[model samples]
Target: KGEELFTGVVPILVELDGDVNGHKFSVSGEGEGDATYGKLTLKFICTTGKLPVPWPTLVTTLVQCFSRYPDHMKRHDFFKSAMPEGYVQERTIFFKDDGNYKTRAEVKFEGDTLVNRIELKGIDFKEDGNILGHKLEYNYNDHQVYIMADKQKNGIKANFKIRHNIEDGGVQLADHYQQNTPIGDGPVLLPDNHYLFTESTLSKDPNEKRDHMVLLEDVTAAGI
Candidate 1:
């Protein structure tokens, strides 16, 4: 056992609509390789809709899965040029209550397309705090976050999944991407050893309560 492997600050923006709604968040993590410790900051960019229940907290944990993630994290080849022969990876995000099991969300990626097939178990979006309680299994198919680095701008720009299968509890619903483009427009490219300067838009629809974006920036301290 050890302590403090890598530390960095990643700012994320959850934007809804063109410019009417946006939520600014700063994610900082410290742990052995992956994000085992961190806290996220909440800031309002533009006020339009009611406060998004469980989203702020949910996204924070999602960020942990990607915070300083690479190689050892396993499951997926994040920056790999091409998907391994018939390679498939999946992980489960569990929501627990008082050390007891509450529910689980599954993030599945296919080898061929790299589409994220998310399965939210017993999810009830109307409820505040924890959004998992129902008995229905909501499947979000053909979803993927497009991660790309802009060489000229010298930063990462990730376009989040544009669409999903579920309608009710599939937070942050956006317009569909072009035909045959399940993972956004093009391939995802991220250079190594660069500062974590990135911005990602979750959804574009304003009606969706959880529509937002994320911006990751500044590696205060990092070491492999």
Candidate 2:
């Protein structure tokens, strides 16, 4: 067989609320990979950041603040209805467990909207028949929501703070601890390599200790 393919850091900005509370917050770090008909392998290191507060509070605050946007609130309602019963407003796997399933939320602007979906899956865990035991999976995804703004600079600002231990039983135990990580699909480059997405993040750090900078590296495709 022929070598099939290959692939690809960030401030540790962990999410401190809802599911994955107190987990390390960051982005998918540098990585590379290859794949075949029956198997695939990838190797990379993930970066993490420290939390300044508790996770639950951080999450609550994030949602509350974001809800201030009229469009975001509408999409939030839509997302709630779109989910299966018991998925929202409760501590189900979709909201608490960091595994292979996913939960989606949306944000919209007058005519356009974007949806942010979070996914978690079990990996490296033991399997017994139909059940898996002792599994650990990394959190990553096509999870992001962005509504195009009317004005170039009048779009929403992404602001967040990752905290730890906001409530009891939220922290991960020995075999199962959550990592604080946060990422976004924002003003990113389009697949065509010509257009750019324009989203921004505002750090809660007074001195701007954890501020993230935006940059564009290239406009080329790696494969034919």
Candidate 3:
């Protein structure tokens, strides 16, 4: 539907303070992003073994980060007619400190990975399908990154894992994904497997009366 504008891989680091299974924990992770679309993969290692990780706050944080890039302007304007007045205004200040969490994020062309010291023998990636019309796919250590709109909420969700080795069992804690909340928001930590991610919603329309799991007022009231 559009021309290829720009593409590049970037190194990202985010230090976060949030909840993990109702406990306070600090986490720092290094990841990579394809710049315009979203972060392809991210890994987090917490300080305590009682690993309750933060909200997918990184999902919102990373999606918000993309707004700073030139490509964001195109979509911003393309969708401007559909967005509410406060949308742009609110998004402008979205990155400030909030009671929910504190984050120190950095993006650069070159950086060292610090969270984990593992390397993939090679990458095997495949994706096909659509959220609006068909089922989606995330394979071979690829992370989850998708955006879609429900009646009351328009949002983005992302989650990722590492391929420790080149074997079927190399996928750490195989099938652990099923343990986390699949289509909602919350923290997760289950035994040897864990997932931490937060969903970020764009703006909503109060005039639309159709309902869903989340309310439009809820997002607005949260000051997001």
Candidate 4:
């Protein structure tokens, strides 16, 4: 399915604080000149799926291809509306900067869509919501683009100075974001709302491109 079928779109700048399966939802994007250059954020507390596909699989699949590693390395027709006139997105190589932890990753994009297709070979950027330190698994290694890091192992924060200053094609002062799930960094519950979702961003250079996400971390996470 590396080829294009039918193509078209509804490119717009929008924001919403709504609901998913009775749970709360939040998101926003202030990227660049067009919708193609900014990061997109979609956070939700709960959600349901279409008849044939289960909810977990549906959402999980999206995270896998868009935000997860390995699987985030391809293009899909579903992203058709997001691409430039004829340029299909390629890959998403990234660096995440959490106050304590960091991660460098390579994401994917479909030839027909304008999702995030970016990269790196190692980690120097701290990732989000993590209690545990870091890793050396394929999560940080892809093909030949490899990187390294050495941080002061403090209680919950670290002066995580990265080794080798790696990442082949990426940024600095870039709006870094991290998702800390396995190590237990996550969203909290809201009073009036049933549940929650989350994301983060530092200041963006008006000349640089910024990216983001919208997530439903876990149903078991809050108000249910």
Candidate 5:
């Protein structure tokens, strides 16, 4: 009942011009976890010089998935940046671990804040303990992270954000252990006595989007 799970259908694509070893083979494996979990993997034959991207990674879902995600609220639930306009990404969801209906956690930017806000709901979001559906956020600002959690147990909420994990796990816990390492914090008390701990970082790119977006990289993923 308490374990990290990865399950969902994500539309993934890679645009590169190079050998697999150089970077093509690397980019070809993008979003593969969701593909692995949901059985939506689009494996291709990279024979000799061929790097085939299994067909239909998102074609069926495209017509409906793309247009539907741009709306607010469900943004993260159905979005990922790095695509050409009109191309939509599957949103990273909040509330993983402790549930089988898995969704990945993600970072977001708001005005002066670097935040991660997740809300877990649904039957799979059931609790063996007094826990219930959840709402959690990890807000990182400058050098601090302010986390928050609200659960539906007898109703204890431990969800939180990190102003920043100057450094960086649960429900299927994971994050950026700096050098890709993940220094930890908390197990600390939540005024209510419930515990909260997880992972954030800021950016330094003036030419970046206001939200300060960046291209996804293999080094940034958990457990290569």
Candidate 6:
């Protein structure tokens, strides 16, 4: 069976309008699951001026933040040490030579930890192949908390993409490009919880196969 979880963080940026500067931020996440497989979602909202930098610069800055955290490498070391003595890691490549680029990676589990390292090499440098644009390394703990480190320009925006997954994964494009920001008092999740809404109702047409009048009304009422 499939299970789902909700996770979110309200990042208090220097600028509330997608700016990158020396801004203070807070993170909150939650997960719900059962046996075989599960899903988790996260959110980040900025609550300040303009970040002192741009997107590319901001991404590198965040990576440095995680690297310097006192407990950062320690966490990785813990998992490495706790894994079974002879457990072999399984590797899987998700995309290979898609139109835009070629992507692949190795994935495996040691004990309860899930490790995935993906490398994407851009093709047509000026047209398609260019140098590699980014690398995403994800570390998932037993708690289902996924710590992701993005190593390139586009990768910086990946977090926002993740928010989309949280907002609309099951339904096609449910939360594409939805705004994420201030609405709160407690952790980001507590204040931002009310912003989550499903847009699948819009896909229904009276003249089409499915009747979504009731579904649309339910989604509308939840937003209000």
The candidate that wins on TM-score is 3
Model 1 lDDT tens row, 1-20: 00112233323332222111
Highest lDDT scorer: 1
C-alpha root-mean-square deviation, each candidate:
16.1, 18.2, 20.0, 19.7, 21.0, 19.2
lDDT of 3: 0.26
lDDT of 6 by residue, 1-224 (tens): 00011111211111112211222332121111111111222122222322222122111111011111122223221112212221121111111222122223222233332332233322222222111221211111011112222222111111112211111222111111111121122221111111112122112234633211111111110111
The model with the greater lDDT, 3 or 5, is: 3
Candidate 1 vs. true structure, TM-score: 0.25
Error of 6 at 149 (Å): 32
For residues 88-153, could you state the per-residue lDDT of candidate 4 as single tens digits?
112222323422112222222334333322221223333321211222211111111111111221
Candidate 1 worst ten-residue window by lDDT: 98-107
Which is better, 5 or 6, measured by TM-score? 6
Superposed model 2: Cα runs more than 4 Å off: 1-18, 21-98, 110-207, 211-224
**In model 3, which regions exceed 4 Å deviation?**
1-7, 19-23, 36-39, 53-63, 67-224
In candidate 5, residue 19 scores what lDDT?
25
lDDT of 5 by residue, 1-224 (tens): 00011124444442322221122321122222231222222222222343222111111111111112212222221112211111111222222343221222222223322222222112333333112322222222211112122222111122222121111122222211110001122121112222111112222346533221112211111110
For every model shown, what is its TM-score relative to the native structure?
0.25, 0.18, 0.29, 0.18, 0.18, 0.20
What do the candidate models score in CA lDDT, each in turn?
0.27, 0.21, 0.26, 0.22, 0.21, 0.19
Summarize candidate 3's per-residue lDDT along 37-125 as a digit string, tens digits.
43345544553443332122223332222222233233421111222111110111111111122232222112232111111110111
Clashing pairs in 3: 20-52, 55-197, 56-197, 56-198
- Model 2 local distance difference test score: 0.21
Off by over 4 Å in 6: 1-37, 42-99, 125-224
Clashes of each: 10, 26, 4, 29, 41, 17
Clashes of 2: 26
